[PDB]
Amino acid sequence: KITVIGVGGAGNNTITRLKMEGVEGATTVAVNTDAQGLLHTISDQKILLGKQLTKGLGAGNDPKIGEAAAKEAIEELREVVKSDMIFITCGLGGGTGTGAAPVIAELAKEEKALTVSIVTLPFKAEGVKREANARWGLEQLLKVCDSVIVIPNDRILEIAPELSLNEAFRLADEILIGGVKGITELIFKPGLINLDFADVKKVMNNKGTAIIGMAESASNNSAVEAVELAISNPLLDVDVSKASAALINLCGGPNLTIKHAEEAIRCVAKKIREDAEIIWGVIIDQDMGKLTRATVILS
Amino acid sequence: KITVIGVGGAGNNTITRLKMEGVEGATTVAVNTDAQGLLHTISDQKILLGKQLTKGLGAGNDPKIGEAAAKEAIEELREVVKSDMIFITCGLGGGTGTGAAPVIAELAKEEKALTVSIVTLPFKAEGVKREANARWGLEQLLKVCDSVIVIPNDRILEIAPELSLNEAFRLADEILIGGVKGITELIFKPGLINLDFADVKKVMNNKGTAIIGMAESASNNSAVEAVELAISNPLLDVDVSKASAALINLCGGPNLTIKHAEEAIRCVAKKIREDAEIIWGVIIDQDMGKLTRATVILS
Amino acid sequence: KITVIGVGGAGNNTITRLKMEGVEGATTVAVNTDAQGLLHTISDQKILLGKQLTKGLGAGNDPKIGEAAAKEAIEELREVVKSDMIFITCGLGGGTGTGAAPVIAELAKEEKALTVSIVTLPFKAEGVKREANARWGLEQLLKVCDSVIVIPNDRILEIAPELSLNEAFRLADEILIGGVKGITELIFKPGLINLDFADVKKVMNNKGTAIIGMAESASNNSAVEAVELAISNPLLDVDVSKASAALINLCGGPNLTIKHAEEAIRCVAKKIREDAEIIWGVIIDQDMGKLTRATVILS
Amino acid sequence: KITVIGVGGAGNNTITRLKMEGVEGATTVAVNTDAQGLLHTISDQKILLGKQLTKGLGAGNDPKIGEAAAKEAIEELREVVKSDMIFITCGLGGGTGTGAAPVIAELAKEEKALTVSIVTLPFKAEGVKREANARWGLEQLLKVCDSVIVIPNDRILEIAPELSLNEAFRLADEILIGGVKGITELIFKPGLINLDFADVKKVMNNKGTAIIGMAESASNNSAVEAVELAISNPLLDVDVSKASAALINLCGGPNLTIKHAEEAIRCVAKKIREDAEIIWGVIIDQDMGKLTRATVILS
Ligand SMILES: Nc1nc2c(ncn2[C@@H]2O[C@H](COP(=O)(O)CP(=O)(O)OP(=O)(O)O)[C@@H](O)[C@H]2O)c(=O)[nH]1
Ligand SMILES: Nc1nc2c(ncn2[C@@H]2O[C@H](COP(=O)(O)CP(=O)(O)OP(=O)(O)O)[C@@H](O)[C@H]2O)c(=O)[nH]1
Ligand SMILES: Nc1nc2c(ncn2[C@@H]2O[C@H](COP(=O)(O)CP(=O)(O)OP(=O)(O)O)[C@@H](O)[C@H]2O)c(=O)[nH]1
Ligand SMILES: Nc1nc2c(ncn2[C@@H]2O[C@H](COP(=O)(O)CP(=O)(O)OP(=O)(O)O)[C@@H](O)[C@H]2O)c(=O)[nH]1
């Protein structure tokens, strides 16, 4: 199954937006000490954290207090990580986000499940105190989870600097929703060279930083342009030379030709390490025109 | 009897293509760990592999996992390879394709059967991961079997760089359907130089690689042109200088002349080793007239 | 008695053609391990050679397999070989050909019977395997059998590229049918110089090859022209400057004169080795008008 | 008595010709190894040769086999040679002709009977075997027989090469007809000189080659012309200057004059050896008129 959980106030916003837009095959869960935030957020399972220590009045800038509030409701928390694929979303540098995420990642690992972590670095102007905590959380998180995706918040101010705040954070959510709606297709309707969950587990096992996302294109070179757009999202870290895995899930129509598929494979292969491990596969449907989607994963 | 067994996703695709086209005298069997592929494939015997290890997910990029999975259900596959002629079709460089090829080819050999392997090399621009294990599978398969046919996908891009997705793989499948039609044609319709399965098991139990496939012609030199077309199929490998077999099966109408038949034999006789062995045969019927087919097998 | 047996596919074809045309005073036997050929052949006494070792599929390019199969079923085969005149016809190169002709010839020889063998050589452009195998078979047959008749198959190519294989192998059948109808004539309708089987046993026992055959003529020099046509028959390029036998059997009508008969004898007596043993004979009837048949058993 | 026995195919043909023509006072016997010829020969006593050595098929161009076969049935053979005058007809150079003929000759000689043998040399263009066999047979026969007659077949070519074989051989039969008719006309009916069997025994006792024949004439010199025709028959041409016998007896009519008889006597003695006895004679009957026959048994 697919379970996406949000730890901290930042994670609750991502869970809220993801649930508002709606996804298929994924279950939304929110974990946060402050009961005030959980009241306004919308999801299915709202597992309140350690009220016996926090009572629901926030954590503050102390990851130790977040960890102490965590690792107390583990008996209740263990039931939610009993799935196949999990997406832990947490804004680092805060309170419960930097403390509950490590213990939840370890708990999900002990349940033998694939983990993907979505973190967001704080604004540079927030302060050295606010950024050191986020760096500490990020460095220790990659030792537990096998895939970490980092979205620097200040990057939003360099790509989309004129929006009504919420939609500025919508770009950060775009990566997560795209990855979830792409993976839920990779574990769905097959065809030709269709992949399954085993390939996903192989491509996302003990690697580190990862890049995921999808795009669309309806030009003459539909597959190539869609892949190029998906692999180069503006708000992601531009570092793909040191990559040792890949996954391509072209979902074009009958108009797609073998030359275009081979060109897409060449374009993904030429931008990463020569000794890469490409696990591709094409799903084909006789309902759409030249438009071709492209789900891409790197690590 | 004639059995065609597919291994891996490529094997399932080839078996589906053969079943849709319709083959006389052949029985289709598909074996692959991924239960999704077997669910969405078309075949008579759908023998699932060792789900006790990797139920319904797939071997990924791990030939050893497929090797272990096949050995789990080795008893179930022993009762299906107990035939006369077997065609193991599997796309090398993958998962179960590279792992269920060795143990099933050996299993078929222990039943005293004539083995023909149809494999497809992966794309050159697809990473060294897909290429090294494909080479390993080819090297181990030529050891366990006596006839191996290789059709690299790159050649397809140099033959049909256009048309829909399935047409390229159908062109890859053309040689196998042509060969299975030729083999099932020798058993029926005895001719003047009538051949039988004993002659077939003279050129397929020796040497390594081989080239098979039929063709058609309707000009004045019908037999000669048909033989020249069948001997030089585009996507097949071009190596006829080092050949030590021939199974020419000129099957034309009464309009065929002795000069044309002798010329057709001499055409293949002059393009192979001087010390080669020819086991030719001819079938004559009054229903095709000028049109003459030509089934050719090398080694 | 007159018995003609055929070993191999070529032997079966010759037996079928001879039965189709019809022969009086002769019996037809077919021996070939390939039960597929026997199922569609036309004859009277069919013996399936090698019922155990071959199983009825075929022999392939293995004369040793044919030899073993012949040795397997000697008991049921010796019964039919007990006669006076036997015609063993075969196509060299095959498993049931060169590997099964010497054994049956030896069985006939150790039965006190006159043995005549007719072999068909393979096409020159069929590799060194067929040529060497045919040479070995001919060498091992001429030692045992007393009179062989060799018609290379390329003679049909370089003489009559007229019709299909079904109507050009009939041109190679002319030798055997002409010999049989013309040997069965000696045992009927005694003439003025009446001959019988005791003379045949003398003329067809020297050694080596023979050019037996018959022809007809209707011109003023009926006997001479018919004899010249019969002795220099096509497909027989073997030089006849050396010979030690003759069975001229002029069977003309009352119009024949002493001068014409003497010229018919002399034309043969001048075209062969100077010292020779002519066993000529003449049959005269008031029904053929001017036509004169020219049966000759020159060896 | 007069018995004519034929050995060999030529002997059987001559016996059939003589029986068809009809001769009074003579008995026809045919002896031949092959029963096929005897089944069609028109004769009274058909005594088969040595079936025990060889069945009734043929001799096989071998004098030894025929001679050995004759010795097998000597007991039955002797039953017929117990007569006064015997005519052994045999075609030399063949099988039983060079076989039973010497043994029947010696049997007749032992039985104290007058022996005359008629042989026919084979055609010159029939190889060295036939001529050598004929020479050996003639040399052997002249030893054990008191008189032989040789009429080579090649001589008929220079006399009447425009007649059918069945009728032109009757031209060679005229010698035996004249011999068997002149002898009968001596023993039967009286004459003025009245020669009997004593003179015949005198003129045919251990001499060798001889010329025997009769002729008719009706000119003014009937007796002179009739004698000259019978003394110079076109078939047998030998130097008569060395002859040592004569049986010139005539059968003229009343018109015959003493001068004509003296001239008929003198003409023979003019062209032969001046020595040796001329046992002449005359028969007179009042029916012939000017027509006068002439029989000569010159030796
Ligand atoms: N990209 C985004 N970052 C966010 C968002 N909301 C908060 N954040 C970031 O996350 C960080 C704050 O983390 P939290 O809200 O989990 C802090 P804490 O657990 O102490 O929250 P309370 O207990 O509710 O006070 C900080 O760097 C923010 O800039 C959002 O909607 N998008
Ligand atoms: N010529 C073709 N090659 C194919 C086709 N499908 C797959 N392949 C090739 O075969 C290889 C993939 O092999 P498989 O599908 O057996 C890999 P695996 O066993 O891991 O499949 P899953 O367990 O379903 O993931 C790869 O090189 C493909 O390019 C096809 O239809 N035609
Ligand atoms: N002149 C002819 N040659 C023939 C004919 N059929 C076969 N052949 C020749 O004979 C040879 C083939 O021999 P066979 O048919 O006996 C082969 P084999 O004994 O292996 O029979 P199978 O087991 O049925 O294959 C080859 O040289 C042919 O060219 C025919 O009808 N005519
Ligand atoms: N003048 C004739 N010569 C004849 C005649 N028939 C045969 N011959 C000659 O006699 C010779 C043949 O002798 P035979 O017929 O006795 C030979 P053989 O005893 O072997 O006869 P078969 O046993 O019947 O084969 C040969 O030279 C012939 O030319 C005939 O009708 N007339």
Short mmCIF file of N, CA and C in Angstrom, two decimals, chain B residues 41-147:
data_model
loop_
_atom_site.label_atom_id
_atom_site.label_comp_id
_atom_site.label_asym_id
_atom_site.label_seq_id
_atom_site.Cartn_x
_atom_site.Cartn_y
_atom_site.Cartn_z
N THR B 41 -1.37 -11.63 -19.61
CA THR B 41 -0.88 -12.32 -20.80
C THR B 41 -1.95 -13.25 -21.35
N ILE B 42 -1.71 -13.74 -22.56
CA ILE B 42 -2.61 -14.67 -23.24
C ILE B 42 -1.82 -15.93 -23.57
N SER B 43 -2.16 -17.04 -22.92
CA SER B 43 -1.49 -18.31 -23.16
C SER B 43 -2.36 -19.42 -22.57
N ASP B 44 -2.02 -20.66 -22.93
CA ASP B 44 -2.77 -21.81 -22.43
C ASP B 44 -2.32 -22.21 -21.03
N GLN B 45 -1.05 -22.58 -20.88
CA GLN B 45 -0.49 -22.97 -19.59
C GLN B 45 0.24 -21.77 -19.00
N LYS B 46 -0.30 -21.23 -17.92
CA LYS B 46 0.30 -20.11 -17.20
C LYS B 46 0.86 -20.67 -15.89
N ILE B 47 2.09 -21.16 -15.94
CA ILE B 47 2.74 -21.77 -14.78
C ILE B 47 3.49 -20.67 -14.05
N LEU B 48 2.93 -20.21 -12.94
CA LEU B 48 3.60 -19.21 -12.12
C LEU B 48 4.86 -19.80 -11.48
N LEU B 49 5.87 -18.94 -11.33
CA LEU B 49 7.15 -19.35 -10.76
C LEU B 49 7.06 -19.41 -9.24
N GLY B 50 8.20 -19.40 -8.57
CA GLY B 50 8.28 -19.67 -7.15
C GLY B 50 7.82 -18.53 -6.26
N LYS B 51 6.50 -18.37 -6.15
CA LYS B 51 5.92 -17.30 -5.34
C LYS B 51 6.31 -17.41 -3.87
N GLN B 52 6.81 -18.56 -3.43
CA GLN B 52 7.26 -18.69 -2.05
C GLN B 52 8.43 -17.76 -1.73
N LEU B 53 9.09 -17.20 -2.74
CA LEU B 53 10.19 -16.28 -2.56
C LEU B 53 9.84 -14.85 -2.94
N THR B 54 9.28 -14.63 -4.13
CA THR B 54 9.03 -13.29 -4.65
C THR B 54 7.63 -13.20 -5.26
N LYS B 55 6.62 -13.62 -4.49
CA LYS B 55 5.24 -13.67 -4.95
C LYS B 55 4.79 -12.35 -5.58
N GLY B 56 4.40 -12.43 -6.85
CA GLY B 56 3.66 -11.37 -7.51
C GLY B 56 4.36 -10.04 -7.62
N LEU B 57 5.68 -10.00 -7.47
CA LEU B 57 6.42 -8.75 -7.57
C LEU B 57 7.42 -8.74 -8.71
N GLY B 58 8.27 -9.75 -8.80
CA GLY B 58 9.27 -9.79 -9.85
C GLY B 58 10.68 -9.85 -9.30
N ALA B 59 11.62 -10.33 -10.11
CA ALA B 59 13.00 -10.47 -9.66
C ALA B 59 13.78 -9.17 -9.68
N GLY B 60 13.26 -8.12 -10.31
CA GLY B 60 14.03 -6.91 -10.44
C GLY B 60 15.26 -7.14 -11.30
N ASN B 61 16.33 -6.41 -10.99
CA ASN B 61 17.62 -6.62 -11.65
C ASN B 61 18.51 -7.52 -10.80
N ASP B 62 18.04 -8.76 -10.63
CA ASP B 62 18.76 -9.76 -9.84
C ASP B 62 18.54 -11.12 -10.48
N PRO B 63 19.47 -11.56 -11.33
CA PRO B 63 19.34 -12.91 -11.91
C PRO B 63 19.35 -14.02 -10.88
N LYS B 64 20.06 -13.82 -9.76
CA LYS B 64 20.12 -14.85 -8.73
C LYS B 64 18.75 -15.08 -8.09
N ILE B 65 17.98 -14.01 -7.89
CA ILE B 65 16.64 -14.16 -7.32
C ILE B 65 15.76 -15.01 -8.23
N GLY B 66 15.80 -14.75 -9.53
CA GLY B 66 15.07 -15.59 -10.46
C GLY B 66 15.59 -17.01 -10.50
N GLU B 67 16.91 -17.18 -10.36
CA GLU B 67 17.49 -18.51 -10.32
C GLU B 67 16.95 -19.31 -9.15
N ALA B 68 16.90 -18.69 -7.97
CA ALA B 68 16.37 -19.38 -6.79
C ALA B 68 14.87 -19.64 -6.92
N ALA B 69 14.13 -18.68 -7.49
CA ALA B 69 12.69 -18.84 -7.61
C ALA B 69 12.33 -20.01 -8.52
N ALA B 70 13.04 -20.16 -9.63
CA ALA B 70 12.75 -21.25 -10.56
C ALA B 70 13.03 -22.61 -9.93
N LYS B 71 14.12 -22.71 -9.16
CA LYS B 71 14.45 -23.98 -8.51
C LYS B 71 13.39 -24.38 -7.48
N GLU B 72 12.66 -23.41 -6.94
CA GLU B 72 11.60 -23.73 -5.98
C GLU B 72 10.50 -24.55 -6.64
N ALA B 73 10.11 -24.19 -7.86
CA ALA B 73 9.05 -24.87 -8.59
C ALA B 73 9.61 -25.69 -9.75
N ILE B 74 10.76 -26.32 -9.54
CA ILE B 74 11.37 -27.10 -10.61
C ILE B 74 10.54 -28.34 -10.93
N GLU B 75 9.83 -28.88 -9.94
CA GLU B 75 9.00 -30.06 -10.18
C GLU B 75 7.84 -29.74 -11.12
N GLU B 76 7.22 -28.57 -10.96
CA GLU B 76 6.08 -28.22 -11.80
C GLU B 76 6.49 -28.02 -13.25
N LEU B 77 7.70 -27.52 -13.49
CA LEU B 77 8.17 -27.30 -14.85
C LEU B 77 8.82 -28.53 -15.47
N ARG B 78 9.06 -29.58 -14.69
CA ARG B 78 9.60 -30.81 -15.26
C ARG B 78 8.58 -31.52 -16.14
N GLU B 79 7.30 -31.44 -15.80
CA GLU B 79 6.26 -32.15 -16.53
C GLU B 79 5.83 -31.44 -17.81
N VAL B 80 6.37 -30.26 -18.10
CA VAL B 80 6.00 -29.52 -19.30
C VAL B 80 7.07 -29.57 -20.38
N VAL B 81 8.33 -29.82 -20.03
CA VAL B 81 9.42 -29.84 -21.00
C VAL B 81 9.64 -31.25 -21.51
N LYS B 82 8.75 -32.17 -21.15
CA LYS B 82 8.84 -33.56 -21.61
C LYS B 82 8.16 -33.70 -22.97
N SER B 83 8.81 -33.10 -23.97
CA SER B 83 8.29 -33.09 -25.33
C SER B 83 9.45 -33.35 -26.28
N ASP B 84 9.20 -33.15 -27.58
CA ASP B 84 10.21 -33.39 -28.61
C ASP B 84 10.96 -32.13 -29.01
N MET B 85 10.25 -31.04 -29.28
CA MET B 85 10.85 -29.79 -29.71
C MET B 85 10.39 -28.68 -28.78
N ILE B 86 11.35 -27.94 -28.21
CA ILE B 86 11.05 -26.87 -27.27
C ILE B 86 11.73 -25.59 -27.74
N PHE B 87 11.01 -24.47 -27.61
CA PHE B 87 11.50 -23.14 -27.97
C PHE B 87 11.44 -22.27 -26.72
N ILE B 88 12.59 -22.01 -26.11
CA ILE B 88 12.68 -21.15 -24.94
C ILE B 88 12.91 -19.72 -25.41
N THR B 89 11.89 -18.88 -25.29
CA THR B 89 12.00 -17.47 -25.67
C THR B 89 12.08 -16.62 -24.41
N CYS B 90 13.13 -15.82 -24.31
CA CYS B 90 13.34 -15.00 -23.12
C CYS B 90 14.24 -13.82 -23.45
N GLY B 91 13.85 -12.64 -22.99
CA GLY B 91 14.66 -11.45 -23.15
C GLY B 91 15.77 -11.37 -22.12
N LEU B 92 17.02 -11.51 -22.56
CA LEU B 92 18.14 -11.52 -21.65
C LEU B 92 18.36 -10.13 -21.05
N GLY B 93 19.21 -10.08 -20.02
CA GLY B 93 19.55 -8.84 -19.36
C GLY B 93 18.54 -8.35 -18.35
N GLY B 94 17.44 -9.06 -18.15
CA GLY B 94 16.40 -8.66 -17.22
C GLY B 94 16.52 -9.35 -15.88
N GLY B 95 15.38 -9.79 -15.36
CA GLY B 95 15.32 -10.48 -14.09
C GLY B 95 15.18 -11.97 -14.26
N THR B 96 13.95 -12.47 -14.14
CA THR B 96 13.70 -13.90 -14.31
C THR B 96 14.10 -14.40 -15.69
N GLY B 97 14.20 -13.51 -16.68
CA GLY B 97 14.62 -13.93 -18.01
C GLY B 97 16.02 -14.52 -18.02
N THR B 98 16.94 -13.89 -17.30
CA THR B 98 18.32 -14.38 -17.24
C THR B 98 18.51 -15.49 -16.22
N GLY B 99 17.55 -15.71 -15.33
CA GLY B 99 17.71 -16.69 -14.27
C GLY B 99 16.92 -17.97 -14.47
N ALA B 100 15.78 -17.87 -15.15
CA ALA B 100 14.98 -19.05 -15.46
C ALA B 100 15.30 -19.64 -16.82
N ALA B 101 16.27 -19.08 -17.53
CA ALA B 101 16.77 -19.67 -18.77
C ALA B 101 17.72 -20.84 -18.50
N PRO B 102 18.69 -20.72 -17.59
CA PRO B 102 19.60 -21.86 -17.37
C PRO B 102 18.91 -23.11 -16.87
N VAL B 103 18.17 -23.01 -15.76
CA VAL B 103 17.66 -24.19 -15.07
C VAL B 103 16.53 -24.86 -15.84
N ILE B 104 15.93 -24.17 -16.81
CA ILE B 104 14.82 -24.75 -17.56
C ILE B 104 15.35 -25.33 -18.87
N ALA B 105 16.39 -24.71 -19.42
CA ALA B 105 17.06 -25.31 -20.57
C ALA B 105 17.70 -26.64 -20.19
N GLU B 106 18.38 -26.68 -19.04
CA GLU B 106 18.93 -27.94 -18.54
C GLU B 106 17.81 -28.93 -18.22
N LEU B 107 16.72 -28.44 -17.64
CA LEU B 107 15.59 -29.31 -17.34
C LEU B 107 15.00 -29.91 -18.61
N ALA B 108 14.91 -29.12 -19.67
CA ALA B 108 14.41 -29.63 -20.94
C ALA B 108 15.40 -30.62 -21.56
N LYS B 109 16.70 -30.36 -21.40
CA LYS B 109 17.70 -31.27 -21.95
C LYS B 109 17.64 -32.64 -21.27
N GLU B 110 17.43 -32.67 -19.96
CA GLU B 110 17.38 -33.93 -19.24
C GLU B 110 16.18 -34.79 -19.65
N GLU B 111 15.20 -34.21 -20.32
CA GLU B 111 14.06 -34.95 -20.85
C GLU B 111 14.29 -35.42 -22.28
N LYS B 112 15.51 -35.27 -22.80
CA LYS B 112 15.87 -35.69 -24.15
C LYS B 112 15.00 -35.00 -25.20
N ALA B 113 15.11 -33.67 -25.24
CA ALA B 113 14.34 -32.85 -26.16
C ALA B 113 15.28 -31.93 -26.94
N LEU B 114 14.82 -31.51 -28.11
CA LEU B 114 15.59 -30.62 -28.98
C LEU B 114 15.26 -29.18 -28.62
N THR B 115 16.28 -28.43 -28.20
CA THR B 115 16.12 -27.11 -27.62
C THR B 115 16.51 -26.04 -28.64
N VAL B 116 15.67 -25.01 -28.77
CA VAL B 116 15.98 -23.83 -29.56
C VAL B 116 15.67 -22.61 -28.69
N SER B 117 16.65 -21.73 -28.54
CA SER B 117 16.52 -20.57 -27.67
C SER B 117 16.43 -19.30 -28.50
N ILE B 118 15.43 -18.48 -28.20
CA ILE B 118 15.22 -17.18 -28.84
C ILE B 118 15.38 -16.12 -27.76
N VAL B 119 16.43 -15.31 -27.88
CA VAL B 119 16.72 -14.28 -26.90
C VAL B 119 16.88 -12.95 -27.62
N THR B 120 16.66 -11.87 -26.88
CA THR B 120 16.74 -10.51 -27.41
C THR B 120 17.71 -9.72 -26.54
N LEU B 121 18.79 -9.24 -27.15
CA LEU B 121 19.74 -8.42 -26.43
C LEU B 121 19.13 -7.06 -26.11
N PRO B 122 19.48 -6.47 -24.97
CA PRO B 122 18.93 -5.16 -24.61
C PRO B 122 19.55 -4.06 -25.46
N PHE B 123 18.95 -2.87 -25.36
CA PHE B 123 19.45 -1.72 -26.09
C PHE B 123 20.86 -1.37 -25.64
N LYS B 124 21.70 -0.98 -26.61
CA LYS B 124 23.08 -0.61 -26.30
C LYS B 124 23.14 0.58 -25.36
N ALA B 125 22.32 1.61 -25.62
CA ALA B 125 22.29 2.80 -24.78
C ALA B 125 21.27 2.63 -23.65
N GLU B 126 21.50 1.60 -22.84
CA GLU B 126 20.62 1.31 -21.71
C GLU B 126 21.42 0.95 -20.46
N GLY B 127 22.67 1.35 -20.38
CA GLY B 127 23.47 1.06 -19.20
C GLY B 127 24.20 -0.26 -19.31
N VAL B 128 25.35 -0.33 -18.63
CA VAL B 128 26.13 -1.56 -18.61
C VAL B 128 25.49 -2.62 -17.73
N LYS B 129 24.59 -2.23 -16.84
CA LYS B 129 23.92 -3.20 -15.98
C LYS B 129 23.07 -4.17 -16.79
N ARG B 130 22.33 -3.66 -17.78
CA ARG B 130 21.51 -4.52 -18.62
C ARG B 130 22.34 -5.32 -19.62
N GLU B 131 23.58 -4.91 -19.87
CA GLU B 131 24.42 -5.54 -20.89
C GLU B 131 25.31 -6.64 -20.32
N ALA B 132 25.91 -6.42 -19.15
CA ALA B 132 26.80 -7.42 -18.57
C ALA B 132 26.05 -8.70 -18.24
N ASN B 133 24.89 -8.58 -17.58
CA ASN B 133 24.13 -9.78 -17.24
C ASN B 133 23.51 -10.42 -18.47
N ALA B 134 23.20 -9.63 -19.50
CA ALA B 134 22.73 -10.21 -20.76
C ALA B 134 23.83 -11.05 -21.41
N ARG B 135 25.06 -10.54 -21.42
CA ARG B 135 26.18 -11.32 -21.95
C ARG B 135 26.40 -12.58 -21.12
N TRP B 136 26.30 -12.47 -19.80
CA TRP B 136 26.43 -13.65 -18.94
C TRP B 136 25.36 -14.68 -19.26
N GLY B 137 24.12 -14.24 -19.43
CA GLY B 137 23.05 -15.16 -19.77
C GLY B 137 23.25 -15.81 -21.12
N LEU B 138 23.70 -15.04 -22.11
CA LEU B 138 23.97 -15.62 -23.42
C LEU B 138 25.08 -16.66 -23.35
N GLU B 139 26.16 -16.35 -22.63
CA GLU B 139 27.28 -17.28 -22.53
C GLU B 139 26.89 -18.55 -21.81
N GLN B 140 26.07 -18.45 -20.75
CA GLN B 140 25.64 -19.66 -20.07
C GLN B 140 24.60 -20.43 -20.88
N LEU B 141 23.80 -19.73 -21.69
CA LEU B 141 22.74 -20.41 -22.44
C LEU B 141 23.30 -21.16 -23.63
N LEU B 142 24.32 -20.61 -24.30
CA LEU B 142 24.94 -21.34 -25.40
C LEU B 142 25.61 -22.62 -24.91
N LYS B 143 26.02 -22.65 -23.64
CA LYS B 143 26.59 -23.86 -23.06
C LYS B 143 25.53 -24.94 -22.87
N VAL B 144 24.38 -24.56 -22.30
CA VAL B 144 23.38 -25.55 -21.92
C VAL B 144 22.55 -26.01 -23.12
N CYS B 145 22.42 -25.18 -24.14
CA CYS B 145 21.64 -25.51 -25.33
C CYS B 145 22.57 -25.72 -26.52
N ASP B 146 21.98 -26.09 -27.66
CA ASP B 146 22.73 -26.34 -28.88
C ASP B 146 22.46 -25.33 -29.98
N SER B 147 21.35 -24.59 -29.92
CA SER B 147 21.02 -23.58 -30.92
C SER B 147 20.54 -22.33 -30.22
#
